Design a binder for this molecule. Structure first.
Ligand SMILES: *CC(=O)c1ccccc1
Ligand SMILES: *CC(=O)c1ccccc1
Ligand SMILES: *CC(=O)c1ccccc1
Ligand SMILES: *CC(=O)c1ccccc1
Ligand SMILES: *CC(=O)c1ccccc1
Ligand SMILES: *CC(=O)c1ccccc1
Ligand SMILES: *CC(=O)c1ccccc1
Ligand SMILES: *CC(=O)c1ccccc1
Lengths: 244, 244, 244, 244, 244, 244, 244, 244
């Protein structure tokens, strides 16, 4: 009982008001050759939401390195956005460098299917991953009660950019796939003639005509992805509530 | 665009044909006191999809530990499901123990919004996480070209059940949150009287009246969650393609 | 190009979330035999809106003495309402004791015609004066750029309650009408026989059969109303920006 | 409910018949560089309405000083308007110099939402404040039983023109605001960069980055506005009923 | 064009506000066994309308003698109707004893088709003659520029009443018809047998089987009708403007 | 339950078949600069209708003098109209010189609202007075049972023509008006400035600024209008039945 | 309760995905001058369907000899088609050289009416015989439980082609018709003149003017058709499951 | 395009007129425990149609043996049917013993989709095979130019009845299937547990878990079905045209 944009569609044309000013999505980021992650949170001055903004801010340099920008969204006003960011910088010691959309009539929220049954008034924890052509590539809907794993958003963007450059599909749990490890998958043949040719070429390691792979990702690309998952797995050496 | 079910809605009533028989969802899992993860893949005998089925099968006991059942979905028929499972058992040495829905007219696909612009004929990589009351708790839409991180699906279910059983919300990147670590968040006050009572009480560690937390998770709960992430971050010991 | 509820209509039945809790309008006030003033402001942490909250708070006991409750309204969340009130108490030294409705999807705003062409997202400065029978008695629409004169809101409610108890209409600028001063107007005759009877009864001061008046308001009633206007007219002895 | 035009919309284009002739609204005042106040009353030869006409007439020069024209409205005919004006001059000694719209089919009444539930036949006491560009700036709906405070209408137009002149918003109860007195408010920053640039310039008195103000109003502007309210607050020297 | 109620239809049920009070049409007159003449005029304090009201008032006793009540209608208010009657009594020396409907939104006017293309806002000079069963017997539409001949309204009600009691049709120009004088017409036969049986019976004077008549009206009936027409033809002995 | 054309509307364009041939209304009379009176009767060989045709025929020259043509209408055929005229000439000694519309399907009757509740099959006694511009000036609907007073139709056309030529409105019962006798009324002023100018000009006899008149009709115009009413009031010199 | 395309209609324009690539029907075959038999089967890895694909593959050269291509259809994906063909080749020793449409959303099935009541999800056993102009010539619907007689499809195509080149209709059970054996039927006369002429010209053997025939089919054409039926009648010497 | 009833649906309820009288379909045959073959032909006294009727008549005993009744259909009237049957008996020496539906407004034809683009007026050569429960089991649409192979209609009802009786599916070209000969197919498993159980029971000859078969048909069943085909393949002994 709700409506979304879909993977492979252009992010819907819209003007949004952020605490950084007015911008056109996805044009603002397409014009810069950037990907963007648009994510939502229910309200300013909410605790899970605060832990997420801090997690994104900590990973901001990692997103920037991938050519990826971040843009938040809640139904709160720009004035609440700025007060909350000031609260976070003051009490947690973390500056939030990226804009937050203000969506008080829920116009953006209804366009993106961010209003679920869990709340009539407040957005769930949506994630739109949009590439530099302004095309939606991945969509996640986390609930109110559960913070995102931001390292998985880095892994998704890194794996998509690698798959796009190297003309490969990405196995489950890459770069630690149980069958092929850091291998990447050759898109399968679409005809009997191609299936025959691929097999009788011996160009790739294969389990069958429809399951071929190689290992074309650079050590640097693989170690960058492994770094995100290592950070997700390791307990942080110091907690930020300690000097708050 | 397209239409979807929403977080907090009852998974829609439907009878489906699987390679284990005909079942009503969600009724079939509710009656066993079980959560289910329903996930979709484009087609049988596709390589990324095969890696995902193998990843789910390795983690089958981890899902059963949480009282979670797995059910797959593609537009292929039962006969194709059974032959693809026999192929994975014979060639990779992995038995797929969970059922797969056969959805040849895309009836289930259209109901769950699993047909995106990337393909008019084959589902993307949808994930519906459904609790023992038949309520949709989380929805993920991964694309054709990118395998899922199955350990994040385990982390989501674990954290959702933890939040339900302790009346807590779960911070970003839990149990390795950068502010509060393995801490869990008390739902914030919703009135000025509750906010006052909270600031006067001293019961919780707190950054403000809206940001309180404690550490009520068992070490077992925390370390099991962290183990999912350590497994995602770990280079596999032996690649299944070799033993194949 | 907008719609409204009308004077003489029952305030529309609605459930609203305030920073004090959930209430039904107009029932929650009708139940108590109380009038309410519902007023709106564009957003929390806006300066004209802050001056108006401080003006209502200073007049709170004046409202309480007439049996009139106050309830604010904006499209911000409850958490922004509590933080804004905290800010006003800390920086201006004034407790806002009355509730504010949180209307993030604009549901209440659209119902009360509070969204004008001046902002698609934020409410203008509306005022609904609602009697103890739940009937809209008066409606004011001030713009973004102009704070209300809260003493005129007191005069309106006092004048309405007097007209109700004494069965009189209230002249322009009462209690300082240039024609009849503190006099109150007998509703005019509706028939020729009623007109002739009124005139030949000599019961009232008259300028014509359609313009009769007396002075049935007590000295206290008149003095209460005159104090509202003297306060509006007088520069306050100390400005609150001193200590602030 | 019923329909209205809205603050920030152009007053609706309309030809109206007045006791002074046929005029186009708002063009007839826009082309003179005049603001106008259009106000409604239920019927000619009604007592409250008569008090309000006399109130407006006594303040006629105050409106002319501000470059504001007055235009009345009821469902009565021109002939009745002229007879009622004659009666007021003869019995009260006050000439009504401004036009009255004759609206016998309620055509203008329905366009401006002046028919409320209190009467299906006669307009309530509507007030439309229209600027010299023809834009609706403020709307007031007083009921049948309650005369308007005309000095507040003067205060509104004066404060609006002052805000437009000096690019300021006007605080509650101006020029006797309890926080900043006769101070006028700088419209708040809309971006984090403007918020920071504002606070660092030290250009204004500030309570916070969103609450800045200065005292740019002339002593004349301030005392004119206070004079309106002192007149509202002063018991009249001589009641005009005495001299009939 | 426009639409109307019709001869032989029941006058439409309506509650109307008059300067004598609220009444229900036609019930108010039916319940008394009285005919009524409802007539409209564009506006109070118009000159042709005034002459028509004085003409009706002069003929009031002639109407009452027939068991016929008068009721007027304009889009003016009750207050204007009472002032207009005051004017006529003071300046012409004539009392208007019959009620005038106040129709300010033109609801009655629209129902009776009294708004013609001569004016969007004021009724023409309609006349509805309604019998004691509440049935529309005759309808006249005079224009703004032309006063009615009120003696023809008397002729119509007297002839219709005569026709009803004597079971006769009334010739052109009765009682001065050029063929049969004060003769009244027997309704013509509806069948060949009735036609033959009327010629044979020799009961009536006849020009053919379809044209039979007799003289059943009393001398007083005829003289009453003749008196109306003689008054119409005679220039009044003294003009009322002279005596003022 | 009926539709009519309206005073001030152009007579509807139509082609009609008469017993004189096919003509277009109103063009046929406009072309000649003639007024026309279109009148209806229920059916040929009916006795009231025959009295009306004889009355029209005897007044024919009075209509021709005024530049007014006559045209009848019934639902009977041309053949019936010719046989009916032959009968009247033979049995009554009166030639009918004007045409009669034949309206067998009631096409014209329905267009002019001539079919009332009194009969679903035959027209009532309608009268359309149409000026030389083809504009409907007056409409009368007499019933089946009551013949018209043809002299009032002459008086209407005469008074209308005189009103048009002299730019005057015609009082009740003109030229025998009880207030101003043969006086004609100046249209009332439309503005306060016109009211005052007219009153201080002394140009007209006046009861008030809205009630001015003079005597600009020739004695010939006045005596001709009065002669119509004298004839209406005269007992006929000899009845046509006696030679008939 | 289903819709089909019809004999004599052009096969509907559609782009289809086969395990040989993407083709446009009927264009792909028309541009080659080829007939095509489009046949459907419920699903890959079903036993009746397998028997039918082997029967078609065994007759592939008989189809090729007639200039007829074969194209299959099921709701299975291309990868399943290729895996199923590998299985047939490996286990039955028969290569399927013709393409199979993949119709996973049943788009083609619904267009062609191939979804009957026996299954909502899987196509019945449809056969469309389409000529070299792209016109549907014959449609067969066999059910799930009954394999087709593929020699009758060869007989149909052979008889239609023969009927096309010789301008003849083909009797029941041709080439073994019990009345005229291998004779072909002259289309009957359409007029009485053609009937008389046919019968007197004595050009053909005849039973009546509507039943003429000759023997224009070549010895080779007849024997080819007889060979199809002899193969259908004869049990194979060795069954393929025995060399399996 | 056209509409059709479907395999697995009840034959639609209809009353039809035949040359044997009125009957209800399918109830007429259901109530006897009889299958029926309803077939259509364009028109009586057409040559292909005649050959087909003669083929059905000669095979009537084979249909009667199987408990199958025959019923024809064309748009011709009953009289034409009887004249046509008389002609066949006289000129060909063959009695048609089964009824023919007369369908002159093509009511039955439209309901069964028997009017294709080949003729707007005459049906094509449709065949409905309906079982004793009144269910459509098979549908064939042969065109105008091509006679049916009646022996294939016998093979279909024989194979269907055998399949119903032995709970088996029938392979292509049965009883001469090139893989399993006169073997009949066990419906494949629908679950993995059923698949495994079947492969372990060793109860059936198998090519795979989805392809099991046995030989449960009597030698008489097999040889009767094979005889149908031998008859189709046999050059006839004596052509009936010779003795005609
Ligand atoms: C800052 C902000 O959110 C704002 C400012 C003016 C009006 C409404 C909202
Ligand atoms: C096994 C399977 O998918 C199947 C079986 C019979 C019919 C259709 C599909
Ligand atoms: C406090 C508040 O406004 C809130 C709390 C939880 C979720 C959304 C908003
Ligand atoms: C003066 C006035 O109101 C008027 C005049 C003519 C007709 C109607 C109204
Ligand atoms: C008297 C009259 O017409 C009136 C009175 C009150 C309100 C409106 C009209
Ligand atoms: C004369 C007449 O009315 C007529 C003539 C022919 C047909 C119909 C009507
Ligand atoms: C296997 C097949 O046909 C396919 C391949 C890639 C994606 C979807 C289906
Ligand atoms: C001849 C036949 O079928 C028939 C009989 C009577 C009426 C119409 C048709």
């Amino acid at each position: 009982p709700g409506s979304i944009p879909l993977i492979g569609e252009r992010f819907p044309e819209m003007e949004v008001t952020t605490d950084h000013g007015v911008i056109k999505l996805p044009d603002h980021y397409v014009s810069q050759g950037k990907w963007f992650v648009l994510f939502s949170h229910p309200a300013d001055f909410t605790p899970v939401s605060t832990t997420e903004f801090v997690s994104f801010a900590r990973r901001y340099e990692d997103f920037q390195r991938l050519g990826v920008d971040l843009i938040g969204l809640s139904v709160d006003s720009v004035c609440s956005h700025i007060k909350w960011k000031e609260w976070i910088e003051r009490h947690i010691g973390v500056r939030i460098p990226f804009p937050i959309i203000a969506d008080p009539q829920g116009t953006v929220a209804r366009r993106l299917g961010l209003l679920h049954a869990e709340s009539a008034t407040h957005t769930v924890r949506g994630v739109f991953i949009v590439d530099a052509r302004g095309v939606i590539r991945t969509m996640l809907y986390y609930p109110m009660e559960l913070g995102r794993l931001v390292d998985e958003i880095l892994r998704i963007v890194k794996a998509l950019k690698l798959g796009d450059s190297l003309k490969r599909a990405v196995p489950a749990d890459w770069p630690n796939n149980e069958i092929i490890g850091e291998g990447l998958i050759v898109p399968p043949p679409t005809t009997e003639d191609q299936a025959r040719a691929r097999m009788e070429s011996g160009q790739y390691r294969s389990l069958d005509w429809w399951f071929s792979w190689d290992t074309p990702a650079s050590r640097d690309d693989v170690e960058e992805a492994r770094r995100y998952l290592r950070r997700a797995a390791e307990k942080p050496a110091k907690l930020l509530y300690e000097e708050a």
